[PDB]
Amino acid sequence: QISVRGLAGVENVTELKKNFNRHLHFTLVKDRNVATPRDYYFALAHTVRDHLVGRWIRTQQHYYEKDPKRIYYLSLEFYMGRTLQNTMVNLALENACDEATYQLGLDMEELEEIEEDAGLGNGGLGRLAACFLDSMATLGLAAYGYGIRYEFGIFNQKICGGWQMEEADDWLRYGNPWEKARPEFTLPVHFYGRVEHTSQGAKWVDTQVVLAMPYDTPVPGYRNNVVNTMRLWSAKAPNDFNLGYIQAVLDRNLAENISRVLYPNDNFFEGKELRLKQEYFVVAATLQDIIRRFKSSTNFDAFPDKVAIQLNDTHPSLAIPELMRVLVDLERLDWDKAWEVTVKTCAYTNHTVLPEALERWPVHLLETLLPRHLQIIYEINQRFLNRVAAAFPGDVDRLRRMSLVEEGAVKRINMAHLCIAGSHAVNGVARIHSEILKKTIFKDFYELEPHKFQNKTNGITPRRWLVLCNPGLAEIIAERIGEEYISDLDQLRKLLSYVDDEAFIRDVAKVKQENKLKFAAYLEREYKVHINPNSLFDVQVKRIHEYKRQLLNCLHVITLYNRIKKEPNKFVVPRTVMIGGKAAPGYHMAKMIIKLITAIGDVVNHDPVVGDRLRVIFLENYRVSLAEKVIPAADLSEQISTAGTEASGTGNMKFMLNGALTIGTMDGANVEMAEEAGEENFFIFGMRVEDVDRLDQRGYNAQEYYDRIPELRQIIEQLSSGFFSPKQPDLFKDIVNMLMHHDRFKVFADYEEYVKCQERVSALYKNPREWTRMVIRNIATSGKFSSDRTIAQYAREIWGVEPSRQRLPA
Amino acid sequence: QISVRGLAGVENVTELKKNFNRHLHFTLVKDRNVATPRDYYFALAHTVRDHLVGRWIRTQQHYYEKDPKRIYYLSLEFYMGRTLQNTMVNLALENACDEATYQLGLDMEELEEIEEDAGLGNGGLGRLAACFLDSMATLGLAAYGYGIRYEFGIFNQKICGGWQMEEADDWLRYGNPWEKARPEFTLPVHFYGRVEHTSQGAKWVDTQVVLAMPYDTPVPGYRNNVVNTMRLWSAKAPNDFNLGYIQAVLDRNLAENISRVLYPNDNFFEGKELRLKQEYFVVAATLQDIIRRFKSSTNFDAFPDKVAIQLNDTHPSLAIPELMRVLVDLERLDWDKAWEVTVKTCAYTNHTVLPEALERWPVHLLETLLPRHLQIIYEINQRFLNRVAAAFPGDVDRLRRMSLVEEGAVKRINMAHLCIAGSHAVNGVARIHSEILKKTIFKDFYELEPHKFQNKTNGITPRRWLVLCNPGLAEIIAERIGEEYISDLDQLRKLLSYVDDEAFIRDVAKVKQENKLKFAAYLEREYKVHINPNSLFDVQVKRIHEYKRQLLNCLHVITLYNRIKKEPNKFVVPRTVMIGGKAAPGYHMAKMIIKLITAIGDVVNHDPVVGDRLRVIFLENYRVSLAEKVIPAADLSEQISTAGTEASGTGNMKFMLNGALTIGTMDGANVEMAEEAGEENFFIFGMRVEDVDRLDQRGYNAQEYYDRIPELRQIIEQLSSGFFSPKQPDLFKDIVNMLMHHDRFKVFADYEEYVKCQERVSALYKNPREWTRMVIRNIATSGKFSSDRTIAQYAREIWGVEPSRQRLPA
Numbered sequence A, B: 001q002i003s004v005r006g007l008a009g010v011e012n013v014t015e016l017k018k019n020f021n022r023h024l025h026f027t028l029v030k031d032r033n034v035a036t037p038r039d040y041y042f043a044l045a046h047t048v049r050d051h052l053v054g055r056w057i058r059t060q061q062h063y064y065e066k067d068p069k070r071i072y073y074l075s076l077e078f079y080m081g082r083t084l085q086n087t088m089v090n091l092a093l094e095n096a097c098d099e100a101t102y103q104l105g106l107d108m109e110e111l112e113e114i115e116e117d118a119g120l121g122n123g124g125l126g127r128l129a130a131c132f133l134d135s136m137a138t139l140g141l142a143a144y145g146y147g148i149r150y151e152f153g154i155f156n157q158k159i160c161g162g163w164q165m166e167e168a169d170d171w172l173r174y175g176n177p178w179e180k181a182r183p184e185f186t187l188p189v190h191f192y193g194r195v196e197h198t199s200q201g202a203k204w205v206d207t208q209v210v211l212a213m214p215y216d217t218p219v220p221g222y223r224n225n226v227v228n229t230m231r232l233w234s235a236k237a238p239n240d241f242n243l244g245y246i247q248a249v250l251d252r253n254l255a256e257n258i259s260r261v262l263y264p265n266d267n268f269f270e271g272k273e274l275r276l277k278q279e280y281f282v283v284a285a286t287l288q289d290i291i292r293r294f295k296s297s298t299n300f301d302a303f304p305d306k307v308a309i310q311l312n313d314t315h316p317s318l319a320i321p322e323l324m325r326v327l328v329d330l331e332r333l334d335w336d337k338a339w340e341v342t343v344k345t346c347a348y349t350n351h352t353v354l355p356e357a358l359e360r361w362p363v364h365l366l367e368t369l370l371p372r373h374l375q376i377i378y379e380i381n382q383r384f385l386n387r388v389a390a391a392f393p394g395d396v397d398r399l400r401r402m403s404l405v406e407e408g409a410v411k412r413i414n415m416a417h418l419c420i421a422g423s424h425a426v427n428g429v430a431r432i433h434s435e436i437l438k439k440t441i442f443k444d445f446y447e448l449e450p451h452k453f454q455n456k457t458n459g460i461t462p463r464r465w466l467v468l469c470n471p472g473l474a475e476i477i478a479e480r481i482g483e484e485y486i487s488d489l490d491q492l493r494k495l496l497s498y499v500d501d502e503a504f505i506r507d508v509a510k511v512k513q514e515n516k517l518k519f520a521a522y523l524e525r526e527y528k529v530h531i532n533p534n535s536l537f538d539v540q541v542k543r544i545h546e547y548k549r550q551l552l553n554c555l556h557v558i559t560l561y562n563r564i565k566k567e568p569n570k571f572v573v574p575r576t577v578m579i580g581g582k583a584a585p586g587y588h589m590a591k592m593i594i595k596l597i598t599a600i601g602d603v604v605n606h607d608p609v610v611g612d613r614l615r616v617i618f619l620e621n622y623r624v625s626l627a628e629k630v631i632p633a634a635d636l637s638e639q640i641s642t643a644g645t646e647a648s649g650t651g652n653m654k655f656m657l658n659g660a661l662t663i664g665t666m667d668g669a670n671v672e673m674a675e676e677a678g679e680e681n682f683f684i685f686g687m688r689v690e691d692v693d694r695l696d697q698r699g700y701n702a703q704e705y706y707d708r709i710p711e712l713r714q715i716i717e718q719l720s721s722g723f724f725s726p727k728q729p730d731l732f733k734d735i736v737n738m739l740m741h742h743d744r745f746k747v748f749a750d751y752e753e754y755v756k757c758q759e760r761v762s763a764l765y766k767n768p769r770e771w772t773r774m775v776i777r778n779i780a781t782s783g784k785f786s787s788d789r790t791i792a793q794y795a796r797e798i799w800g801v802e803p804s805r806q807r808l809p810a
Ligand SMILES: OC[C@H]1O[C@@H](c2cc(O)c(Br)cc2O)[C@H](O)[C@@H](O)[C@@H]1O
Pocket: A122, A123, A124, A125, A126, A128, A266, A267, A268, A313, A351, A352, A357, A429, A458, A646, A647, A648, A649, A650, A668
């Protein structure tokens, strides 16, 4: 149907049809009479998978023969979403498969909806790893993603009586056609035990053993015939485990619990032993695999020339002492040489400055679980602090500030400090964030080793986040400037020459309208909710957090409602306000915010005076597959975190690429987005980082705003009195108390500017032609935010490898 | 190479080769450079599996269109062993696959050794179910095996310091290519809760739910193109299970523990709640599946005309009250009609008369776990006892004896009584056993309902137990009488006309020698143990139990050793005595017997005076795949249970078919074996059932035998004094004490006759020609013991269906 989806050749369609029938028969053991829609999905999945394997085998063979430097991306999260459409896109198979299935009497889009999301992540950090894998394969890097194969990913969110309910994401129930178990590469991982000192070094003895079994998933590059590997470890008990008899067999579950479930926290540290076990499990198994592959290419001087290890946040920080352990205890290298190898191999990416998100593990935990690693950490710390003392003689407070060991009630290890000490490069994820790191939390470290500190502004893959989710937009762009932009997003700048092109303006606006109609229909079909498709689609989708300020959005919604009720017969630009995202199960305030949103919708959506002018909808179960649907449909992107809190954001980039305008603070990557598009083409409001700092020195008094803003006063009175909860008048007491007395994120301080800025959004939307022209100026300047750009920067500036767009033989 | 293994046609070999390469590439994602022997096994397994699927789909389609009466074989055990060779045999693919793999540079026998046993059974009862499935498919019956998919089968046995050690049988670690998951046929199973009485009957409410997910395995008939199904249920937690968050997800293991592990008890009842859950789990899921299939053919009058349910022992006895529950509570049938349907549908097979093996469930357990079923059992009991009272007025003791409820310290339900009451047919498994049932333990029931009681003498499948494991013998037989005997074993009688044929005598003896050489080499290669291949191979392989009297064998071995030591320079027929089998982990005496056997070997095997004249070997990890190796190699089969204790035995039949002579008591099927072959061709010794009864009335005094048999006295003195355990003199004190004071199985009583009989075995073995002629007379009369004969009898006399040898279209 559309060009960017590839060719549907006679030969290819015929072959896809026969291979589909073969899999339905031999693989699924079904015929057309007893086959379910799910059977048809799997038949297609296996058919597409067949096309990967040849390229997958020859890619890995190519790496063995050429022996390039290998990149190992270690992450506790890989938020992959669905694989079927992505594989078709990257292999240029989409139109051919669409044709083949149509001829078999099936709708491919219907079949695509059957696939479960691989929800092995919480949000931005996990999705970044997924975009990164796509870009590394597209740029022909010898890259491996290493993580954990969680049996249960991020919970499925149900809304019951306006409250979030959690249920287990049993994503593997029907099987996973994409993975390949590799039980032959199973490796042992050690826990507990004790340290013995001998005449020939230290020995870690009397350990408990858990086996790590790898499952490999292909990661195809964009039409370059490269297929890289994501390797995910699964926990297995050894067969002599606890070996009355029956209980011993049943107790195998304890060991295998390591890979059972993803911790559902985003931007929050929970210091649980199971999480620590998960973190060591991935690191220990991965490092053995790395070293094995390095030897099968004795002399570890060349190790950093052939190996780069990227630490995604501090979660895999134990890689540093684990590498030291293997090099010193097992390979018999001297400390200084082992340390040189470690530092040159490891690099660390920081993703947050929020104090509650920073990993600080109690010493007593590491003492029991990993006795040898604690000893190595202490030694690293002593040697590091000796360097600090020599550099800054007499500065005793610096020594306490920089220490890997934090003293207090319970002694803790600061994993961020460990990462900086043992890495040759430390980067933040957006220019403002990387600057904040050098100025505030890592200031002492920057002063000691300035060369270590870098910036790598985040990006998103234009394959999933344009071609896959918005083929209509991808097509109208390709019609003008060709297809090369898909792996060279900077080419979108060529669209600036079409800003006054009447045909293009109309086409851009048409694609958005179509996307909105499709999403409005999805809401009626799957959720029985009614919306006006001619209204402005105002959307905020991201994890529920106080710092992300879903509460500020709520205040604006109530302001709009109150203004309508005051002057009912006055015209207002109709809006559909959509908010979605999951709350961490133990985060009370976040769960209260979800309830507030639904409670507002309950009042607003059923007021006859409002009509179709204002609708408030909570988007249930926000996840990658839902993002792919709602983002192309959005008119307005809400990126309203308190300045200095959102390290980068990536949702922001997705909305920009897909034809929404942005209302936002100067926070994270918003700053660079506004810089690229021009501030005139961005709806910027609120305090800058400097303004927050000034308010903090003075002391933030929320009462001042309440006293001086009558519209804000009314809302707080409405909340307190039970306007949005008539049967439970005091339901939102915690929210009011927080807002009034202990708001870390200064919601009231940005309220006036936000509401004013929103009025300017409504004004522009009244002029469709000028709205669309501003949209074109955003899409045209979104190029910098391709993860291809990001990965090329990591490659050249951290890993010391050159990216390549050259095809491998088909 | 050999005829019975089928044709190796040019076309077939070429196709097998290309499909093997396809699976290695697309299925296993490997090339010939990085492929392991296990990869080659799986490539072959998938290739052979492809040939099943077409026949499997069309068999089940045929059953849907013809709508025959369906047979449901319910068992907690299916001891299947390996599947690869069996599938090749039944599909006539063995020679073709051998040729294809040879041309690819691979040895097929080497690849066959890689497959894990499906060890989902303990011994005879589980293996009988496996032989039965093979025969039902071969006889073209619409039959389904229903059981549990245990994650862990019977433990792997390790011998350490002469002691049994258990380790988990993680048989699914590398995957199972034979099974197909059917998550679309997942069914709920209910536990606990309470019973509410309404105006419209009783209701079972507030239950806990476990899901039952079926996995289907094909069961091919012998070259008739029939492929039946074995359906095994796996336990799954519902997704809202216990839905802080993390613990709730981890607790899903509790529900899924139902299908985790097979209870490793053979002929012993362990009254554990987990076992009861297993028993209900299989019954509840199966019955829903049966009823669903019956409706998809309202009027349950026709239910018994379309459904037969066979209960393999009392383990699935809950089928009776569960069927009643569904019919009364859910389908709204009146009690009397539901009972009529139940009785006509269900039939029960008893497998033991040992009191410790009989299932008697505490009422308090059933009260808590299955409250509605207990109520139904009480009602069944009241109505049944009213019938007894009307038939035998005033016989109050009969009423207490026949009751389903046993009074005492803890009230118990006798599941055997439940089965008789609710079944239209009750059978024992050998003529002597079925007679014992009518005369002793079920005498009261036989008197009430004589028509209910039948015999069905056990059998073994000649496919696995001759063609597969002994192709050399199968071939020399086929050379004379053709191939038809493989599915018509009675044809072996034609071999009687060759008893004086010099060519045949030589060929029979040659096949045995070859088998012995091959096994003697297997012992050196895999276990580094040395044996003389010219010695008499004296073997006892079966589970370790006091009733099976491995101890009597031990006494004979020591007698032989002592006689050699007394007269070293006297000639004796050299023997290799092999004993193997697993002991239940909690069965202390059985574990002591294993230690005794190894301890004897430790002394005997290292005595220079003995030389190669006597060797004692414990066969480690006895299982189906090992039986297939050792049984063809045996000269002498030990079947020496105390008369009246071995219900049938099936190992006995396997040895008879494979050219071993039998030394045995007149117990179980031994009686019928001797009847078929002629008593002159069998080494019969010891007490008959009547003799045991006489001794029991008098009182068994072991001291009498000790006092009057000096050779026996010496052995007991040797055991007590520490002759076989110098470092631990009192090690075997428990064994001596048992033998002397509390031997339920009268080991001493049969000692003299046994030793005398063994002397006659050695005498015959000295005359190879006459030994072989007697062997021919055994093989020639083994026909009755085909499970094809057994299943044809069940079909005609219990199920009311006619077997068929007619082929389905290929
Ligand atoms: O860098 C990727 C994303 O990481 C997010 C992020 C940072 C963390 O430290 C953790 Br733990 C989870 C997470 O999603 C940031 O909040 C975003 O600002 C950023 O865009």
